[PDB]
Tab-separated table of C-alpha atoms and ligand atoms in Angstrom:
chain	number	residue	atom	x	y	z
A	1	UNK	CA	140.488	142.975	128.404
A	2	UNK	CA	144.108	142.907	129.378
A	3	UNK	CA	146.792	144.200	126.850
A	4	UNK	CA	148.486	140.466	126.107
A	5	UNK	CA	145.501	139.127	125.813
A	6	UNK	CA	144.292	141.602	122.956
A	7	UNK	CA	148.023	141.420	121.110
A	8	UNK	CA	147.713	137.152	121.234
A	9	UNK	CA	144.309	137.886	119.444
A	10	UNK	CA	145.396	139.543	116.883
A	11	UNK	CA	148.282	136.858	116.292
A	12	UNK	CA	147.284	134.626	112.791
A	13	UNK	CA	147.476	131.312	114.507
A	14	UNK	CA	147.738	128.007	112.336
A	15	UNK	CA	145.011	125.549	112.498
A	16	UNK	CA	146.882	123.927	115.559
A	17	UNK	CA	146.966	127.271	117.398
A	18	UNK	CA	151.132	127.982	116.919
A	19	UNK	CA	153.015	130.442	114.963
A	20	UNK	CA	156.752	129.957	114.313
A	21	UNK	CA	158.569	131.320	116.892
A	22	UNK	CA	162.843	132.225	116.107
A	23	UNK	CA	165.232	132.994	119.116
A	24	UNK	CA	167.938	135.076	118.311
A	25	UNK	CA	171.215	136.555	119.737
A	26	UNK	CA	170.219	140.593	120.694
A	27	UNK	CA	173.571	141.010	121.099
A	28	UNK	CA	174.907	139.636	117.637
A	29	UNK	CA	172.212	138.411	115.676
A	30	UNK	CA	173.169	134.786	115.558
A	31	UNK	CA	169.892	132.489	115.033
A	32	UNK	CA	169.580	130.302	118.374
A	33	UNK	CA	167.349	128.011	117.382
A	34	UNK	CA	163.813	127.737	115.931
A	35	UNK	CA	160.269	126.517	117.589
A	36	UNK	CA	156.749	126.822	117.484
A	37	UNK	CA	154.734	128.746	120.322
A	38	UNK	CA	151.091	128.573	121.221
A	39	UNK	CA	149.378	131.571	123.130
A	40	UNK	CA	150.386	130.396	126.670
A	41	UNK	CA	154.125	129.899	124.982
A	42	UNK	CA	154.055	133.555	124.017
A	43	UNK	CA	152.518	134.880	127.101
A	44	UNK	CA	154.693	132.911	129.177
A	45	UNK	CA	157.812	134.522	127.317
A	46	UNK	CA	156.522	137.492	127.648
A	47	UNK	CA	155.727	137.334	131.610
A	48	UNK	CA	158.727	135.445	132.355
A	49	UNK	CA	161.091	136.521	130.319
A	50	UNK	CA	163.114	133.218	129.196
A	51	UNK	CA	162.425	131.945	125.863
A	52	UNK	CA	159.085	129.243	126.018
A	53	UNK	CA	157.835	126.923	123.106
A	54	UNK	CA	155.335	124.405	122.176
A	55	UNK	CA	156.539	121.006	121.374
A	56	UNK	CA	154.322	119.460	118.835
A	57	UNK	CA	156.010	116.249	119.582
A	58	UNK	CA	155.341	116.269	123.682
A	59	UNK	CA	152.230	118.291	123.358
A	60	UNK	CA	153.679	120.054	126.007
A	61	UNK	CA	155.095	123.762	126.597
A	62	UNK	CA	158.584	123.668	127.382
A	63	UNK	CA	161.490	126.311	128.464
A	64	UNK	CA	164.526	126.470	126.530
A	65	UNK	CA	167.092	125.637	129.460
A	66	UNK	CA	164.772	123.922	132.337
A	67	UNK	CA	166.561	120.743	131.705
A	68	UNK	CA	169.924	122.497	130.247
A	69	UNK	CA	170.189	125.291	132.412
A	70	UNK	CA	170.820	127.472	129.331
A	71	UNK	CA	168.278	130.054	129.324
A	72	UNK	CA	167.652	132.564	126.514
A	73	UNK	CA	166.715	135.650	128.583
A	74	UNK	CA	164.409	137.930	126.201
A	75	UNK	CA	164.910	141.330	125.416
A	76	UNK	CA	162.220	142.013	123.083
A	77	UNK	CA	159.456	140.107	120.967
A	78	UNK	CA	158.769	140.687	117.578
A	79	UNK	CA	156.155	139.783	114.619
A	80	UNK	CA	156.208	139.568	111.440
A	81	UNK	CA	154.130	141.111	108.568
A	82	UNK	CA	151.545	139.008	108.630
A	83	UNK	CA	151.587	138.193	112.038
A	84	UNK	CA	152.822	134.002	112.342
A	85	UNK	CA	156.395	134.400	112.906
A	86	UNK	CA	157.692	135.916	115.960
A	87	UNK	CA	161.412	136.614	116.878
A	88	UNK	CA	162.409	135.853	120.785
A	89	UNK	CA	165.667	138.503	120.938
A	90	UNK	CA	167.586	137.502	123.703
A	91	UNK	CA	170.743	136.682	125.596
A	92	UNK	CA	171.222	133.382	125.852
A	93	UNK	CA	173.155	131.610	129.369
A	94	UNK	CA	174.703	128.990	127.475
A	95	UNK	CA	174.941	126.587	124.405
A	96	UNK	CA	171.193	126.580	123.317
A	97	UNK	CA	171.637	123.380	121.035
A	98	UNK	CA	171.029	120.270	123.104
A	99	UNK	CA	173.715	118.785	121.218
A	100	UNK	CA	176.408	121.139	123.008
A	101	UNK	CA	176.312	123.479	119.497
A	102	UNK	CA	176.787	127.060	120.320
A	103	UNK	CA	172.999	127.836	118.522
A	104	UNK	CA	171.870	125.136	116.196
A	105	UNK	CA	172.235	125.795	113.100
A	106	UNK	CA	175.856	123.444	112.221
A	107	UNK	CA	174.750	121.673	108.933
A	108	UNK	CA	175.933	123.472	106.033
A	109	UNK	CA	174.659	121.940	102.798
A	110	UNK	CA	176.277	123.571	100.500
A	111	UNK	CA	179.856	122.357	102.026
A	112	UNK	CA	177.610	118.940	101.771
A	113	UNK	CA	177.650	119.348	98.124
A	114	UNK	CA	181.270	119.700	97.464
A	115	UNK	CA	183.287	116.942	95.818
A	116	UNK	CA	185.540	115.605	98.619
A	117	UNK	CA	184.540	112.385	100.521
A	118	UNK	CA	184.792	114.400	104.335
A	119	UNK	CA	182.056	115.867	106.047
A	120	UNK	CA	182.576	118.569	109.018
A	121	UNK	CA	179.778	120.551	110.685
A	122	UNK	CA	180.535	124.423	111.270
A	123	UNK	CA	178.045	126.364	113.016
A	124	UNK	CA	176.719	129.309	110.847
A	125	UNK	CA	177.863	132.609	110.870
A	126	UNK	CA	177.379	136.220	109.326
A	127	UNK	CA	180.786	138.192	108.055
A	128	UNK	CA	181.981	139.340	111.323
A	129	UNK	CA	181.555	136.672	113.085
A	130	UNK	CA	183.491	134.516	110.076
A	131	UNK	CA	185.990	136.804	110.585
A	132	UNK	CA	186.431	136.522	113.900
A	133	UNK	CA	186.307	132.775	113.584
A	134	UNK	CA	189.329	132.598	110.996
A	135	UNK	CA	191.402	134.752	112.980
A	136	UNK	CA	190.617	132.313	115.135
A	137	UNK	CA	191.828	129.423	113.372
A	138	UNK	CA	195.285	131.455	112.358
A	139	UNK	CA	195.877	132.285	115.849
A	140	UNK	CA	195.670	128.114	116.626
A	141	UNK	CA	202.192	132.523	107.656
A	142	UNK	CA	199.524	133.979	106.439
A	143	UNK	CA	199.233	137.967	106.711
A	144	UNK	CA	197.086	137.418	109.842
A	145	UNK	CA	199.382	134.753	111.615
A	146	UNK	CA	202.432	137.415	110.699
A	147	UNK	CA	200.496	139.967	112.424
A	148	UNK	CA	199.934	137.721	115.422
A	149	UNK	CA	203.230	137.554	116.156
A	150	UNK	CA	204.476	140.637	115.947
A	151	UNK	CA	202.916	142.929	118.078
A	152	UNK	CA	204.487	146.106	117.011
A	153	UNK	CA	203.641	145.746	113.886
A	154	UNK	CA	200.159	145.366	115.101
A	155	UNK	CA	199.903	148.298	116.926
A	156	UNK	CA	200.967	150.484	114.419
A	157	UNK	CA	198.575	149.112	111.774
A	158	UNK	CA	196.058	150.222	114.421
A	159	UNK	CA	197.297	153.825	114.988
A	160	UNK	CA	197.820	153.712	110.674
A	161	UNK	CA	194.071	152.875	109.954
A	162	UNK	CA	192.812	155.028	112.255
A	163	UNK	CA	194.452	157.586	111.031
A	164	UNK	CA	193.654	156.933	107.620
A	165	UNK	CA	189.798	156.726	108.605
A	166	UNK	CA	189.785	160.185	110.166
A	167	UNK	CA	191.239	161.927	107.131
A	168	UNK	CA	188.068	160.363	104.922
A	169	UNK	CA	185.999	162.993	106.923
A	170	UNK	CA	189.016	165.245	106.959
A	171	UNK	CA	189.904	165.876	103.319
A	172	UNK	CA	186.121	164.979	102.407
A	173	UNK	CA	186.919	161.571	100.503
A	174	UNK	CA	184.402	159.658	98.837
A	175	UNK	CA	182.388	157.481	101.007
A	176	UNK	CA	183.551	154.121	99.321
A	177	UNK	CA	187.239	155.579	100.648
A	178	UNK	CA	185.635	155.705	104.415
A	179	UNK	CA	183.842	152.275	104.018
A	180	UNK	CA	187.119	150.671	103.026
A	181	UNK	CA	188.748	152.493	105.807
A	182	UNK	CA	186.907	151.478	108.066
A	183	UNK	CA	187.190	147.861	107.134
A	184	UNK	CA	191.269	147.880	107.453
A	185	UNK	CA	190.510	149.552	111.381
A	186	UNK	CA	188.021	146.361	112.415
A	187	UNK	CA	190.741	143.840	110.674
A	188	UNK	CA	193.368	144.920	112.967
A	189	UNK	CA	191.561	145.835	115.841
A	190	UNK	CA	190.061	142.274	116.169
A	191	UNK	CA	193.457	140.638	115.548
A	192	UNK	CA	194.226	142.650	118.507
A	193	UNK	CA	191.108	140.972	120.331
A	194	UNK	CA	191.847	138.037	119.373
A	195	UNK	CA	195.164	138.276	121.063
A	196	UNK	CA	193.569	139.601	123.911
A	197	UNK	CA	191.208	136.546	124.328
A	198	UNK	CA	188.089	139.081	123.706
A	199	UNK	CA	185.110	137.972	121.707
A	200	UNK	CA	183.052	140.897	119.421
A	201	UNK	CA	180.237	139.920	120.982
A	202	UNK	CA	181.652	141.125	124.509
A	203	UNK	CA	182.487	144.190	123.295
A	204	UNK	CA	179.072	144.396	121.567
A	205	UNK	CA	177.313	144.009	125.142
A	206	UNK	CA	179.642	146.753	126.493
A	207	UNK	CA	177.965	148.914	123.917
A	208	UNK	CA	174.517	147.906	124.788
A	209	UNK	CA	175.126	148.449	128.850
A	210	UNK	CA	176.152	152.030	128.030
A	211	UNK	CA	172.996	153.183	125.776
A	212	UNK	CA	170.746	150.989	128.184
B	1	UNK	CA	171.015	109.499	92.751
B	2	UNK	CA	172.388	112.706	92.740
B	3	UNK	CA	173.894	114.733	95.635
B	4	UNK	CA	170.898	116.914	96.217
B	5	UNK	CA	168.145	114.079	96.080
B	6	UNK	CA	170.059	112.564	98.335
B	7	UNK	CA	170.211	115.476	101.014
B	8	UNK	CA	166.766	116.007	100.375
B	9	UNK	CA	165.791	112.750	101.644
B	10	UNK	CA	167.313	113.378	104.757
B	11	UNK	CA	165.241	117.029	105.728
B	12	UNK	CA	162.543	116.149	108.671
B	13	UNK	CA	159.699	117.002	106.386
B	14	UNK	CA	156.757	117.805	108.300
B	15	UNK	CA	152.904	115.941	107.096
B	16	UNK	CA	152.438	118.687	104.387
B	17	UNK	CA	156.230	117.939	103.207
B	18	UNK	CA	157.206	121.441	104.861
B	19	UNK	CA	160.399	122.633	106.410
B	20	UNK	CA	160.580	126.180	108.040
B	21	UNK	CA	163.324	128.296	105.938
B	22	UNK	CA	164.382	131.816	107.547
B	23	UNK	CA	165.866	134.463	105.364
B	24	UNK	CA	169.346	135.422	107.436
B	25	UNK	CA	171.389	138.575	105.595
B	26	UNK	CA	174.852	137.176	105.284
B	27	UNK	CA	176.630	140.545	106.400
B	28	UNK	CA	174.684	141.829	109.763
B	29	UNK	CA	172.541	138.774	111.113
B	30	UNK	CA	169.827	141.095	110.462
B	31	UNK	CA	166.786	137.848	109.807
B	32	UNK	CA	164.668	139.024	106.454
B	33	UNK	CA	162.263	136.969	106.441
B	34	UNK	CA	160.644	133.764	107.329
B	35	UNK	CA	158.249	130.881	105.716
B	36	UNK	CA	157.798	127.295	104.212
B	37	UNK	CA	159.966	125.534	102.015
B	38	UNK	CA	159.593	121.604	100.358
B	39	UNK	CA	161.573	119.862	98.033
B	40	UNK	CA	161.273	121.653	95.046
B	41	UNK	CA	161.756	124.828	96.659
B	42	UNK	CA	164.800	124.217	98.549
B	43	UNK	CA	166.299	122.489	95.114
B	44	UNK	CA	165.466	125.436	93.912
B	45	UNK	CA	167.299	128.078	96.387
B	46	UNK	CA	170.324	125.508	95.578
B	47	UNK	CA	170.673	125.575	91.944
B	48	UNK	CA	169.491	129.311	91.192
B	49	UNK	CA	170.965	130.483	94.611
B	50	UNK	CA	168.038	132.664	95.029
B	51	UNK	CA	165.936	132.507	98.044
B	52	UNK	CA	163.084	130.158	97.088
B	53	UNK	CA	159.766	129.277	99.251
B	54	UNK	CA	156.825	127.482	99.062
B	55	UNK	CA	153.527	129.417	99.513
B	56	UNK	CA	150.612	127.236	101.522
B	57	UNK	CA	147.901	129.640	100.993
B	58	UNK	CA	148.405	129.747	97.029
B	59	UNK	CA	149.852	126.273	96.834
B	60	UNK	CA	152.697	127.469	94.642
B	61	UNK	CA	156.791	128.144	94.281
B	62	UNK	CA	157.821	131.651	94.743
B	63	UNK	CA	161.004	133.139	93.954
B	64	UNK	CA	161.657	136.311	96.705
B	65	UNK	CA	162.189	139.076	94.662
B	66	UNK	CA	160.068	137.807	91.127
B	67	UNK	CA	157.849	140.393	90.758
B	68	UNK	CA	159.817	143.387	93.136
B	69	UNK	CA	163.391	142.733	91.929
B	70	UNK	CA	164.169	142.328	95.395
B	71	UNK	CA	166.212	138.670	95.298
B	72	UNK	CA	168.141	137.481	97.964
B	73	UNK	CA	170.815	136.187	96.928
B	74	UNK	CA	171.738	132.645	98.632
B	75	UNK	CA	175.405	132.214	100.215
B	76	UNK	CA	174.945	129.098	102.014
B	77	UNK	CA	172.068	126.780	103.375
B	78	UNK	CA	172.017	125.540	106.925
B	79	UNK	CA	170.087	122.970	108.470
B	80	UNK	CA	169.224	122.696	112.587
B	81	UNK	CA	170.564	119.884	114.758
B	82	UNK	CA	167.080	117.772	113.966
B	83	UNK	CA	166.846	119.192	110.299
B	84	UNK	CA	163.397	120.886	109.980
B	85	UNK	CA	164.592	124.391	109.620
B	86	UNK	CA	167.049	126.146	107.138
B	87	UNK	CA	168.717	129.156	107.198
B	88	UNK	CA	168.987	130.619	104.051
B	89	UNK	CA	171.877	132.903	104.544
B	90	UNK	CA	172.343	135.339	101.454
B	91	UNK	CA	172.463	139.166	100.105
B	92	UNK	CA	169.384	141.097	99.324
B	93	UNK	CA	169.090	143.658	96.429
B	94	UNK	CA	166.625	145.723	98.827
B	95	UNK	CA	164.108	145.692	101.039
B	96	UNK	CA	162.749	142.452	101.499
B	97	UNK	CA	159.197	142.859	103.109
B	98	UNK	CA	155.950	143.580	100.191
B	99	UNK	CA	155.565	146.841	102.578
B	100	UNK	CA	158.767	148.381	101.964
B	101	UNK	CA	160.306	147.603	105.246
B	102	UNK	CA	163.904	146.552	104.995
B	103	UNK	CA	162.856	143.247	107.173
B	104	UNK	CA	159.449	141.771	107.614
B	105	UNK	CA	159.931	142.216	111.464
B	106	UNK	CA	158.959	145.546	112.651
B	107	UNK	CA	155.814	145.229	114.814
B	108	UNK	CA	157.763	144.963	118.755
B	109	UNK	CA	155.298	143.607	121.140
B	110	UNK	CA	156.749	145.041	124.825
B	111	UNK	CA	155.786	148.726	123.275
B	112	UNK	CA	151.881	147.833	123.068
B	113	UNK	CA	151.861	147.750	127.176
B	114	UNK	CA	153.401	151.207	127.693
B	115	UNK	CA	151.448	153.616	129.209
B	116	UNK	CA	150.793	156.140	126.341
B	117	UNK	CA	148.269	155.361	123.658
B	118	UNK	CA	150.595	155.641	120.794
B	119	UNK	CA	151.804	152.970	118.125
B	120	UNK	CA	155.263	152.900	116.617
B	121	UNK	CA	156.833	150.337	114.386
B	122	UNK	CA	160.797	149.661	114.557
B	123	UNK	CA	162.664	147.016	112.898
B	124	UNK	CA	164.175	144.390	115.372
B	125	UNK	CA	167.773	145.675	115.603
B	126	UNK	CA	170.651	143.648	117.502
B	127	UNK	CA	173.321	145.474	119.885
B	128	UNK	CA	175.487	147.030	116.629
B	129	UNK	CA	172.873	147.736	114.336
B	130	UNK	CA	170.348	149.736	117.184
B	131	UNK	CA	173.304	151.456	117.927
B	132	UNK	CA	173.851	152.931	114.646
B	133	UNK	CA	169.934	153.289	114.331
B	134	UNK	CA	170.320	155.909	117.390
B	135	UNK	CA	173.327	157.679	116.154
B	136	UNK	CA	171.104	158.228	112.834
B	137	UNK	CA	168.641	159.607	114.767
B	138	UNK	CA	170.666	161.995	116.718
B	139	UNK	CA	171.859	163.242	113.296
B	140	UNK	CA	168.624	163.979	111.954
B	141	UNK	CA	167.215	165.738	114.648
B	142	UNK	CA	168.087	169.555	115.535
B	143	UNK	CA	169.116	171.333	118.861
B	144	UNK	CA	173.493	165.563	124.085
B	145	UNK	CA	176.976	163.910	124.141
B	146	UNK	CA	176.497	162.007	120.487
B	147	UNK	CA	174.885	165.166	118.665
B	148	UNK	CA	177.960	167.279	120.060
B	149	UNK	CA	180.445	164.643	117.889
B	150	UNK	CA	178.296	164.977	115.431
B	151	UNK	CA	178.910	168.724	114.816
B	152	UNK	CA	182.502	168.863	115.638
B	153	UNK	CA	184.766	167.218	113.348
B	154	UNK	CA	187.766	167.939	115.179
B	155	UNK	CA	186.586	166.544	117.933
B	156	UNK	CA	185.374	163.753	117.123
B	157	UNK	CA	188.604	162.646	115.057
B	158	UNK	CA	190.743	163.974	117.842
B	159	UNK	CA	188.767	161.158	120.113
B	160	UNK	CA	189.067	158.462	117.303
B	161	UNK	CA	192.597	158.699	117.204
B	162	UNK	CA	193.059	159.326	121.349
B	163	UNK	CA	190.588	155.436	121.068
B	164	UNK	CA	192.771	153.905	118.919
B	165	UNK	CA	195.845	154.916	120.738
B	166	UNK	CA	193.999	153.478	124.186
B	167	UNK	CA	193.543	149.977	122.437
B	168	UNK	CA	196.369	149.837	121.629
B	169	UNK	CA	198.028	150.490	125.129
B	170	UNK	CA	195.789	147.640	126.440
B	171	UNK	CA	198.127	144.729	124.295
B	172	UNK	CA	201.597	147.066	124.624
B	173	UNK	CA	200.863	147.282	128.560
B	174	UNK	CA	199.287	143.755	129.196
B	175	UNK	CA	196.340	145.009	130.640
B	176	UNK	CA	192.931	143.172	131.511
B	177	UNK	CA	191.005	142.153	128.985
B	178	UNK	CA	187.952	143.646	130.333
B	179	UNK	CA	189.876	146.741	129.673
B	180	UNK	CA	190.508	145.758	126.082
B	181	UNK	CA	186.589	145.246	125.494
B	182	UNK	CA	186.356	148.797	126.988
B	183	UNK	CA	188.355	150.372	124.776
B	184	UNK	CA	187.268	148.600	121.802
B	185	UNK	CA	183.534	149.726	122.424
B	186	UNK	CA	184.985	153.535	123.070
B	187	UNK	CA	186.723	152.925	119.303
B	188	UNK	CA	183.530	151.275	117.814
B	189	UNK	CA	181.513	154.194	119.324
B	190	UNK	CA	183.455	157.036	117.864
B	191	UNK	CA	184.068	155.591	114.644
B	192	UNK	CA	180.352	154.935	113.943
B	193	UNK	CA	179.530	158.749	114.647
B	194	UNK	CA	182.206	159.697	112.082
B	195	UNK	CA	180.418	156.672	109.382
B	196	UNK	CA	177.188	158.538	110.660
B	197	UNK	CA	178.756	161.646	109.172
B	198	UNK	CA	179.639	159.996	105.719
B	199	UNK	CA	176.792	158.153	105.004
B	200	UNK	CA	178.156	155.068	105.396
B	201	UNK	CA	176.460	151.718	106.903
B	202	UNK	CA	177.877	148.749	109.107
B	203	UNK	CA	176.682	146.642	106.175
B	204	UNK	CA	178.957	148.070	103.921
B	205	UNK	CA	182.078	147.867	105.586
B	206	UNK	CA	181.312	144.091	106.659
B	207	UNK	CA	180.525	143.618	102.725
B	208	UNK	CA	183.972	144.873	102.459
B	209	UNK	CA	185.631	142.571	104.684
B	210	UNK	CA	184.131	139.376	103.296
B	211	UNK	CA	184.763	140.429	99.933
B	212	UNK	CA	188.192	140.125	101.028
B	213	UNK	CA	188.441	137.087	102.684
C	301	ZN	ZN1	152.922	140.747	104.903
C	302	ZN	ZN1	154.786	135.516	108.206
C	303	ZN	ZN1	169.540	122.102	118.537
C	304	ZN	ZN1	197.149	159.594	106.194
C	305	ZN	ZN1	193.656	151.616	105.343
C	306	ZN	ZN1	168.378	118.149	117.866
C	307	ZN	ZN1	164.405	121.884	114.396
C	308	ZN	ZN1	156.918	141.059	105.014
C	309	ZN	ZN1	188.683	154.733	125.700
């Protein structure tokens, strides 16, 4: 036959012909959003190269971004074990919730749970990307506020920690003496991006132009 | 009613009184796993904060992790903007596919129309993580500008520290921040070589850094 067609065959379809189909950041690993895709959906991502979904809803295919203009431009397409869940990894244009939310997933239950009569969406995010976000916040005093305004300081925290990484290989330290090293060099280097108005996920796409 | 009854009532449960729920690993992004999850089983996830499912072809709770000791253990819950899909976002105690994989997502579609006829699995790596996947690999293999890094230590620190330095000069002597990003991928780079050389994963040192606040 033709090679798509043979790989859609050998997808394990529901009973309504869809399998659940995830976009995700390929630059960061942020979840996007979450659909469902039928064989055309797939095939069309896979020809076209911007994320495409079935709406059970509309009965209809539909392109994240043809209304929006935020596109998720795919990278690569992956499945599962058992072959029903499939992973769109892309870069996405622009906020990919309709609502304006950066991906979205805002809603965080457990917060929900709490005992205090306030509720605040957050979108979610993984450790160094919550990092990034309360540096954030200081910049907007704490250790991190202290080292915001004094750039010096700063700076030679960098120079420090780098050091003090270098001489874990060095003087043959244990590995739980690199990991921790390594840990006080991101800290201060991203305070430093934060100052600079850079976002990791730049620099992570910096690193994936290079090795591309 | 009670706090979770009354969040439960407001999931978009689908006719079988399904929601999707995705497996996220709170440190890297790096998505586990994916299936179905209804009342009981999201309760569930809540109160034992353990990654909890429900399974449509044996009609039953499962617990990720009760028979191969591989739990993932549940940081925080996340509904989408029209609430039929969680994240579960959590810690796993090892590799979370039955096969052994560290993911369940390791079959990449683009490879099958190459030109070769060859098969090869890969987990689904983002930008960070497939970097540190290729550094590995330039490790293991034997006699290219990463391999030469990785058997020179003096080197390779020399260039950490000369990095570091150039970072730095992009705050001390207001340069662009494209520059800044530049530099910061040239540190990121080199320091990953010398984490190739100690065994040491991106995981960890993000595990680190939440651990600390
Ligand atoms: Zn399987
Ligand atoms: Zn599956
Ligand atoms: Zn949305
Ligand atoms: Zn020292
Ligand atoms: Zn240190
Ligand atoms: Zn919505
Ligand atoms: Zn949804
Ligand atoms: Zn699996
Ligand atoms: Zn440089």
């Amino acid at each position: 036959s033709n090679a798509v067609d043979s790989l859609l065959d050998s997808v394990k379809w529901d009973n309504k012909g869809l399998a659940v189909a995830i976009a995700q950041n390929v630059d960061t690993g942020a979840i996007l959003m979450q659909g469902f895709a039928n064989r055309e959906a797939v095939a069309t991502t896979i020809s076209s190269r911007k994320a495409t979904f079935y709406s059970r809803s509309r009965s209809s295919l539909w392109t994240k971004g043809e209304t929006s203009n935020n596109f998720i431009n795919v990278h690569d397409v992956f499945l599962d074990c058992d072959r029903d869940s499939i992973i769109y990894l892309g870069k996405p244009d622009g906020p990919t919730c309709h609502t304006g939310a950066e991906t979205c997933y805002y809603t965080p239950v457990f917060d929900l749970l709490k005992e205090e009569e306030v509720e605040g969406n957050k979108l979610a995010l993984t450790s160094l990307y919550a990092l990034e976000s309360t540096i954030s916040q200081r910049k907007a005093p704490s250790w991190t506020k202290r080292l915001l305004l004094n750039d010096k300081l700063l700076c030679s925290k960098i120079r420090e920690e780098a050091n003090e990484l270098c001489e874990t290989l060095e003087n043959n330290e244990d590995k739980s003496r690199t990991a921790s090293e390594m840990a006080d060099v991101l800290y201060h280097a991203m305070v430093l991006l934060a100052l600079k108005d850079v976002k990791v996920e730049e620099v992570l796409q910096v690193l994936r132009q290079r090795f591309s």
